[PDB]
Amino acid sequence: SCSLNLQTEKLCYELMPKHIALIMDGNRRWAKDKGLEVYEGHKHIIPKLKEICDISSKLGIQIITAFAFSTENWKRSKEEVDFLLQMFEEIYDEFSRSGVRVSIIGCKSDLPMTLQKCIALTEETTKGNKGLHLVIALNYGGYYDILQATKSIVNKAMNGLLDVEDINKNLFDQELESKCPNPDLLIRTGGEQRVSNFLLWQLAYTEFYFTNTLFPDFGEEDLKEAIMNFQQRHRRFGGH
Amino acid sequence: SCSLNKLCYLMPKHIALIMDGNRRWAKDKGLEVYEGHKHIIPKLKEICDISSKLGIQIITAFAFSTENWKRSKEEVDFLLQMFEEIYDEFSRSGVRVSIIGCKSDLPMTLQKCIALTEETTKGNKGLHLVIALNYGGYYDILQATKSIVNKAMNGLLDVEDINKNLFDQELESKCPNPDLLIRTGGEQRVSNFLLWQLAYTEFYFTNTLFPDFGEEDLKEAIMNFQQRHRRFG
Ligand SMILES: C=C(C)CCOP(=O)(O)OP(=O)(O)O
Numbered sequence: 001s002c003s004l005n006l007q008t009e010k011l012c013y014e015l016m017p018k019h020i021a022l023i024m025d026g027n028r029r030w031a032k033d034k035g036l037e038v039y040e041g042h043k044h045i046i047p048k049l050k051e052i053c054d055i056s057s058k059l060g061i062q063i064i065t066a067f068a069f070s071t072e073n074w075k076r077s078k079e080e081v082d083f084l085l086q087m088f089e090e091i092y093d094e095f096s097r098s099g100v101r102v103s104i105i106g107c108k109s110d111l112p113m114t115l116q117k118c119i120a121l122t123e124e125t126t127k128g129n130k131g132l133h134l135v136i137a138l139n140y141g142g143y144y145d146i147l148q149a150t151k152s153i154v155n156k157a158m159n160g161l162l163d164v165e166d167i168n169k170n171l172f173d174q175e176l177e178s179k180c181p182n183p184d185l186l187i188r189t190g191g192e193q194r195v196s197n198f199l200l201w202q203l204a205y206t207e208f209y210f211t212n213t214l215f216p217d218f219g220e221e222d223l224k225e226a227i228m229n230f231q232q233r234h235r236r237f238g239g240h
Numbered sequence: 241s242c243s244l245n246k247l248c249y250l251m252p253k254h255i256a257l258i259m260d261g262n263r264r265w266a267k268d269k270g271l272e273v274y275e276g277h278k279h280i281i282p283k284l285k286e287i288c289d290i291s292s293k294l295g296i297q298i299i300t301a302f303a304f305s306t307e308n309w310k311r312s313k314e315e316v317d318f319l320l321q322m323f324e325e326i327y328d329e330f331s332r333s334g335v336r337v338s339i340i341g342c343k344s345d346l347p348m349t350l351q352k353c354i355a356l357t358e359e360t361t362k363g364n365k366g367l368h369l370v371i372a373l374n375y376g377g378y379y380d381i382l383q384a385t386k387s388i389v390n391k392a393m394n395g396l397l398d399v400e401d402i403n404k405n406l407f408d409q410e411l412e413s414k415c416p417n418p419d420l421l422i423r424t425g426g427e428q429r430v431s432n433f434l435l436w437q438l439a440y441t442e443f444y445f446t447n448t449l450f451p452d453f454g455e456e457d458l459k460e461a462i463m464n465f466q467q468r469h470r471r472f473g
Pocket residue numbers: 025026073192194195196472473
C-alpha cells in the first residue's frame with residue numbers, strides 16, 4: 001500500500017553549491033594527445049584533486065565526492081588496474097597534513113590489504129580536520145550503494161528492529177554510504193553525457209554540468225565557469 | 241559482506257522522455273497556463289506514432305511526479321482531471337499503454353480511466369507506451385524494498401540472495417532500461433525520474449519546449465545518440 005500526495009518535503013539540497021560531485025574523465029586521451037604513456041595523465045589525478053579542493057574550500061564549498069573507480073572498471077586492462085590501485089596510496093602524502101577530512105565509500109573489503117591499511121590510516125589521520133570533506137568513491141557504484149542499504153534494511157526487519165511501514169526516504173538516506181546533503185552540482189569532464197552508475201539515489205535533483213575538457217586540463221578557470229553556470233540556473237524541485 | 245567484481249539496455253530500443261516546458265510555452269504565447277498542458281497528451285500520441293515508424297519499441301514518459309503535488313490546488317486539479325483524456329486519445333489507437341506510479345492517491349475516476357485504458361490496449365502489438373503518473377525514483381526504489389522485505393519475512397529469500405537481478409524484477413520500470421533520455425524545456429537534471437534505470441542511459445537535453453517538440457527534433461536526438469555510440473563503444 002502506497003501514499004505520496006500529502007507526504008512531506010524531504011529534500012537534501014541547496015549562490016554557492018554546498019556539495020559538488022565530480023566524475024574525472026579523460027586521462028588516457030590526455031596522455032595520447034600530448035604524447036606520454038597512458039601511465040601518465042593518471043599521475044595527475046591526485047595533484048589536480050588536491051588543487052580542486054583548495055580552490056573549492058576557498059569558495060565556501062563544503063563537500064566534494066569524486067568518482068575514482070567504479071565497480072565496472074575492474075574489467076579494464078590487467079596492467080592498468082594494478083597500477084591505479086597502488087597509485088591511490090599516495091593520497092596519504094597529499095592530504096594527511098592538510099585541513100581536509102577524507103573518507104572513502106565503497107566495498108573496501110575486496111581491495112589489497114595494503115590499500116585497506118592506507119585508506120584506514122588516511123581516514124583516521126584526517127578525521128579531525130575542520131575543513132572541506134573529500135569523499136573518494138573507490139570500488140563504488142550506484143547499484144551497490146542501494147543494494148547494501150537494502151540488505152541492511154532487510155536484516156533489521158528480520159530482527160524486529162523495524163517494520164515495512166517504517167521504510168521511507170529518511171530511513172534509506174541513513175543506510176546509504178553517500179548521505180545528505182546530496183550534490184547540488186555534478187561536473188563530468190571528458191565529453192561523455194551520462195552518469196555511468198556513479199551516484200543514482202543522490203542525484204534526483206542535482207544540476208548537471210558537462211564539459212569536453214579532459215580532466216588534467218581542468219584548472220581553476222574551468223571550475224569557476226562551472227560554478228557560474230550553476231548560479232545562472234533556476235531550481236524548482238517540482239514546484240512553482 | 242560485499243562482493244563486486246545486465247539483461248537490460250544504432251536505433252534506441254527504449255526512450256525515456258521528460259515532457260517539460262509547458263507553462264513557459266503558454267506564457268510566451270500570451271496564453272493561459274492551462275493551454276500549455278492541453279498539448280501534453282496529443283503531442284505524446286504524435287511522438288508515439290513517429291517513434292513506431294522508426295522502430296522504437298518502448299517509450300517511458302514523465303507526466304506527473306511525486307513532487308508536483310506542491311503546485312496550486314487549481315493547477316493539480318486541472319491536471320488530474322485532464323489526464324482522463326488518456327482514455328480518449330489511446331483506447332482506440334495501436335499503442336499498448338501502461339501506467340506506473342501510486343495509483344491509489346489519484347481520484348477514483350482517474351483510476352478507472354487508467355484501468356480501462358490498460359485493459360482495452362493490452363493486446364496491441366505495436367509500441368509500448370509507459371506513462372509515469374504520480375511516479376518518482378525514490379518511490380519506486382522504496383516500494384521495491386518493501387516488497388523484498390515482505391518476501392524475506394515470508395521465508396522466500398535470504399539477504400544473501402539480494403542482487404541486481406532480484407531488484408530489477410521488483411521495480412515498476414523493468415529491463416530493458418532506457419538507452420536514451422530526452423528532456424525538453426532547457427533544464428539539465430532528472431527531477432527524481434527513473435533513478436535506478438538511468439545508470440547507463442545517454443542524457444540528451446534540449447531547449448525546445450515540449451509543445452514545440454516535433455519529428456525533426458526527435459531525429460536530431462537520435463542522431464546525437466548514434467554519434468555518442470561511435471565515440472564511446
Ligand atoms: C568501459 C568503457 C567504455 C571505458 C570506461 O571509461 P569510464 O571509466 O570513463 O566510464 P564510461 O566512459 O563507460 O562512462
